[PDB]
């Protein structure tokens, strides 16, 4: 099934391309922070996950996202319009984005097994690692699981809310 | 099983949640009775279709009393009134909590998973009716109860009168005012 | 796979429901013409696939299509638009529309056959009754198979062609 | 300007449109009696225009007898039926020839054209019978009454009843079943 | 130039509208507290503007915008989202939308002076006590220049920039 | 008022852009029958009236339309599609787009007289020449006033209106 | 199955085409060799679908030729050549015929199926000369490509030159603009 | 007029930003001297269009000075260095508290207005740059001005090197890998 694994890498694709934007704009902010040092490494963790699924598009010969140029402004927009409200809105938009990542692999890791885990076996394996990256983020002292402001977990799923769109518009389009 | 683990672990939770509520601390508290995200929006999402597959069963078992005799039928208005009646009564021991699970129903991106179980939980009750619609007044239908059930929980959670006689006032005027529509 | 099975009732209950309006606005404008009876027998046949269709979606609980409202009045002035061209603009929309059915009933019976023939045997077997009286017509002399004029099967095209996107459109809302 | 002459050139061709059509023909034909496209949109789009203009003069004239007690109020049913007569006995002239410019008011690039006319006259009619919504029932009884208006024109179109009986006929029974929605 | 008043009253028709059905989704909420009198004030206000402008479209013949349906329930359903959030996401909600119809009401009136002050003279007073009322707030404690919290401030934005999308839907549909 | 010159030059400037991709279609197709001498000089004389227009565009400072590429191949393709059919149905098309072009001159002629005739002397002059060209054409035996086929008549309809909206979108995007 | 059949009475039609047409009459003459709608849509689409699957093992077996030996790689430009005048010459058997068969390829309703086909060529085509690109680049190699074979489709048509001499300069000059960007 | 008074009171207000901010406080103290929303968008966006009409007073100025042979004309990537990095440079005296300025321009009501600002800036800049295009190539050339501004803007926020070399040598890098494209 083509067709299926086709819009599973071009939407893995378009949604590390996204936030490989994100930490371009809250790098051009904040890069010479105290913060520097961890979006830095946040955005050198999703170059490699981006190259891995360049590498998986070129080797399945998959149709990229015609919206890439659109994902290109808004993620840059949103990465920078976020961590000029400071660190707390920065941190707010990277939980939102990695927690948006980590919600879409574990959908299909869940339709992979259901299919053929003899067939799709290299396929999920990388997923899942790349899944379990997504919120480890110790050693970086960014913690998923902290009590944010009222208002900042409303800011965080309005992000989230608009990933989930943008996810569903790049498996299509 | 695999995931069966965490909705054993999500259905031991629901013993703890009138004490500390729907926080990811009864998530582990509900676990730690039984051995092995912090917002709780996957433990209420669990209650929510739980307990819409609850009152299905409820429905299921009411209609077959009155198909074979033991129970008389009802006017859709009366029907309508006692199915959403039914369904309020579940979150009785959840009543000090639960507008901070309907904050976290209404987020952004869990809107689409709470409309969905909205969507359902009305078209059961349409079905038990016997609704029959192929035309728009299907949804004209279901718009119209899912509003009777969205503001009659609202006035629920702010409710002091004796076994909530004042919501059930609420929900049949409510009822009323739509089947004269 | 109820989800299959009522994406399929729903958009072939939309598409008997638009195409008994287009009768409908045919039989408003050419009703007491020499072709009045043709239309009135092709406006019975429909009838009885939309009742057909009525019963299945009771039986399997299925969500009709949120464009009753929009099909019940572009059908009507699609069908009363042709007829008052005259009888050859009224039977090029009639092909237009019974090919434009009968072309979406062969897609649904080469996907029911794959999953589960046994399982969707009562189906199949409406399926293929209703297909085989939208292409016969022969009792009336509309033949599928008739020299159309070069601008007239460009309007039977551009019919066509809005029917697909309406059967389209149907099948998701 | 210039609009004021092809305007009196428009007024003078409809003399001839019963025995020729809606036509150039005609148009060069009732100028020809002045002295001074081919598809015919503009004059059957003028004589549409002026029969609207004519049918809100009526109205308004009927409601100063009601006003002043030279006539009796009616109900909106029978106001509604009267309306739509009374607009569409202006057609009877024309009769031969006007699913001709039907056909014409129904080609694509018309279509915006013939239904901001046909919303102005179903407004004006609604608006002599009291109504005056300000929630989507100003849509719902807009939508209602053109509908009914339009297939009442079509059995008006091949009706051969003395004085067009069944076509009103058809008209009272399409009023009362939409007044009781 | 009735085309310009009509798109005047039709568009303030419909924020007063979506005003009313915020407070009401607000009163659903918190109606028992200790700001349940604050909001009962601001419903009860704009009933008053949304009694007038119901007046006006009498008058004037103007069609009323096609989205109120959706209007009435994205209102009910924005208010009643904020003030679960608490006091503070209620109030933000309130002066984004009291700010929202007033920037509006500055637009129309810059506009409905340059073209005829003496024909559009009673339009004119009314606005401008509208628009007064819409910023006044000083009885109840509501203060339309107070520091939020950085996250409160683009909650406050992103439902501001929501009701400007309503507003330019709203004058053309 | 350089906003509505801007909606004027732009939306002119567009729709002879498509006139010109519409004869190079029609040229591609139907170029060495007998009537490529008819179709090159209706492609010649809209070369002159494009780069008219582009001349006051930069003259101007206009904004260029957003759908010229949208334009570029639904133009060629149009024309293509035509002239496919026949010699009927690509002179079909070039009355249609000959009469939708001299239509939308007219909106412009009697809106840049009710404003000032003298300020927009040169630009009223200009658009009433084109707007005469658009219509003679009978050095080559094109009349605009022709018995068509009514099934030409009704693909010349659907043509003329969706150059209607292609001129409604382009004055805005 | 029976698309085994209509595929094989579709192939047999092919070889009566130049004589008859995309007609239906060599539908029937063509399985009248074999033993058993009359737009001809699905026997034009079946020869493009066909005529693109020997395109590709074409490219495939010159790929295969030049990792090896006995052939050396050349050019994008004078690659992308090569493959459209190897693609187009697959019509020349068909090529009095043709532009009737594009008539109904332009077809409103077979728009979808004709682009999808089209789109299908041009990324062989472009995944053969070594493409491998993940961006918005893919888009318009591709769309550029598309255009090129259309125009030089139609210059095909028309043209009388020997061995269709001036189509290839055709396309050369539209290949060589085009690597000019 | 009335206006006038409030663009008297926001020139009066930018002499005290760089004390205070771009905070309602420095509104009302730069207003006591000349005269009698807190959000400060007013203030911010007052300020960014009168920098763009500085900006198009010099390019106007140095436009005359070439064409009287006075100045040598440059080449497009010379010109758009010069003219970007001479409105950045009206930042300089404000460029402690324009990182909170930037924030609020990027606010989701505010993001229309500070597009329209931005596209005219680049639009004058290109202009005078001697671009005619008429084709997609408008939009191309200046959205690529417009990210270039905004990255090099970013840049000088953070850009501690004297005279801020380190800014202009970003933005030549950035204008030269722009004109190979
Ligand atoms: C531009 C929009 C054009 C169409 C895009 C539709 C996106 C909406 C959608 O498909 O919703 C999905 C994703 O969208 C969202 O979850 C956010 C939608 C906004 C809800 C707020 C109201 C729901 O799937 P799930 O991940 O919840 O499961
Ligand atoms: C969550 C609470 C709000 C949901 C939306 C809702 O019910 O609000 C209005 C929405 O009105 C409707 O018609 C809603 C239709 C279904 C919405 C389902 C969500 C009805 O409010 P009311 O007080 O007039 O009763
Ligand atoms: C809404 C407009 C398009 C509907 C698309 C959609 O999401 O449909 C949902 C329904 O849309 C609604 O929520 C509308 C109903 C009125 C509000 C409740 C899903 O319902 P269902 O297919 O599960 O139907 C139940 C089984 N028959
Ligand atoms: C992140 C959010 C990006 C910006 C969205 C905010 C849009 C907004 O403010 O609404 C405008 C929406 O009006 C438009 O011009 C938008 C065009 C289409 C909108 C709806 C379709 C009204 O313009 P204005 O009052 O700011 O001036
Ligand atoms: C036929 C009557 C119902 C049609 C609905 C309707 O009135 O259409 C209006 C609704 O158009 C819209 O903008 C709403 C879009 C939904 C249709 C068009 O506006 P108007 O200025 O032509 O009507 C004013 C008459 N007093
Ligand atoms: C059939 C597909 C489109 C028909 C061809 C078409 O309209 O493309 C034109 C538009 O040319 C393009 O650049 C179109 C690019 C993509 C079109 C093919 C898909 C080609 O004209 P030109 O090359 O002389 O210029
Ligand atoms: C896509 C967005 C909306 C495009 C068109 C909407 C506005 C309609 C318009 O531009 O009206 C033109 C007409 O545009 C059309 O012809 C619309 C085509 C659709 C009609 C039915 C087919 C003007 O012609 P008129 O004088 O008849 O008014
Ligand atoms: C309106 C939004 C989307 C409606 C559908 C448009 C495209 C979606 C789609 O899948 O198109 C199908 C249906 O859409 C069409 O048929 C579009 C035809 C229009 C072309 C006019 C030139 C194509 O299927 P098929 O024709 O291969 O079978
Ligand atoms: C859709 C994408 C672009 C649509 C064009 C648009 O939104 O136009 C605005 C302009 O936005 C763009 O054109 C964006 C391209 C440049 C980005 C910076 C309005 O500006 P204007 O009409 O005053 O003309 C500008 C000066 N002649
Ligand atoms: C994008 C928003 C642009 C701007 C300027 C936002 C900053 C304003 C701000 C401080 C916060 C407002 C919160 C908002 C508007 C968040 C919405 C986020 C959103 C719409 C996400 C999708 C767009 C995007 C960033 C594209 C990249 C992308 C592609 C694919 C998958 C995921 C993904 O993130
Ligand atoms: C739709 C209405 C056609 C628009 C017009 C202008 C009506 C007059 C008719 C006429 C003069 C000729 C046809 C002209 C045009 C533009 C043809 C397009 C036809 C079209 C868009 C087809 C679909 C119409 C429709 C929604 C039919 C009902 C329907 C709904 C769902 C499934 C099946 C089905 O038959
Ligand atoms: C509507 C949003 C409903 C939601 C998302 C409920 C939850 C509320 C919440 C927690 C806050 C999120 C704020 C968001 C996402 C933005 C608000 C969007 C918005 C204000 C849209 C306007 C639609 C609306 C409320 C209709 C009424 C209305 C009509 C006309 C003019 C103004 C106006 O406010
Ligand atoms: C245009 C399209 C979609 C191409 C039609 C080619 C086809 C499908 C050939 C079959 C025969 C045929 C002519 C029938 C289809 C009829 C259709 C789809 C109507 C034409 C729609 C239309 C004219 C749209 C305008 C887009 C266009 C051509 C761009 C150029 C353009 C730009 C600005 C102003 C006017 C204008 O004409």
Redesign the interface.
Known sequence: SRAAVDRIIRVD?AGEYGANRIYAGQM??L??TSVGPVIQKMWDQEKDHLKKF?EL??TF?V??T?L??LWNVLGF?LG??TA???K??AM?CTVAVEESIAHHYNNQIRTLMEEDPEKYEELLQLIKKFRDEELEHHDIGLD????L???????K??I??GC?VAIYLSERL | SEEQLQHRILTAALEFVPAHGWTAEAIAEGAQSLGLGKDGSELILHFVTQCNTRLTRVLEEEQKLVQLGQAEKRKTDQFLRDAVETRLRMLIPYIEHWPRALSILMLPHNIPSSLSLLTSMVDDMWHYAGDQSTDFNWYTRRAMLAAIYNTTELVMMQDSSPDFEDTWRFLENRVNDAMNM
Chains 1, 3, 5, 6 share one sequence.
Do not use: F, K
């Open positions: 694709h051009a902010v890069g010479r360049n598009m070129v010969r149709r990229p015609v890439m140029p927009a920078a319009g000029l409200l400071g707390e809105g707010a998923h699981d902290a009590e402001a009222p208002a900042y977990a409303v800011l799923s309005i989230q809310a989930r």
